[PDB]
């Protein structure tokens, strides 16, 4: 498990070696760094992708929603507590994702 | 009481009402947020008679 967080110098130090086969099994990253560092994650291929707290995805108009949608993935899993609380529109957005 | 507040409410600008609500919540949560309790001191006359 690679915890991809920190200031840019250590962040890129943590990037070092990511292209090697089996360099790591799973990478966990925060949505702020996904919107920050989108190029790095998009270049790599990420097999099965999971999103926790999918309620944050809710607005398809957000740039992070678009970025996440562009990311090439083999399978996708969306995890959120109780999305049904939300207006239908957000549910449609998620299903479209 | 402030008439401008009433006018704001009348406007129906959802944002303006949201802001008003925020100000109400701030007032309820602790008065220092809305207005620090003024440190009371004597009135000062400019010059003695």
């Amino acid at each position: 498990v690679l915890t991809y967080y920190g200031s840019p110098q250590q962040r890129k130090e943590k990037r070092k070696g990511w292209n090697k086969p089996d360099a790591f099994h799973v990478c966990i990253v925060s949505y702020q760094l996904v919107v920050q560092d989108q190029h790095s994650f998009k270049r790599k291929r990420w097999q099965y992708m999971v999103l926790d707290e999918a309620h944050n995805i809710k607005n398809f108009r957000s740039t992070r929603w678009q970025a996440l949608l562009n990311f090439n993935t083999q399978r996708r899993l969306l995890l959120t507590g109780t999305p049904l609380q939300n207006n239908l529109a957000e549910l449609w957005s998620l299903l479209y994702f | 009481s402030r008439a401008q507040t009433k006018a704001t409410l009348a406007s129906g600008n959802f944002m303006s009402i949201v802001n008003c609500l925020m100000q109400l919540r701030k007032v309820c949560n602790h008065p220092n947020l809305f207005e620090v309790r003024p440190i009371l001191t004597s009135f000062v006359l400019e010059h003695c008679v």
Binding site: N86, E90 | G12, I17, L21
Partner: peptide, 15 residues
Amino acid sequence: TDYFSKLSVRDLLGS
């Protein structure tokens, strides 16, 4: 989500 918006301005204020 409507629920909170369905409480109209005067419905929030009350009487």
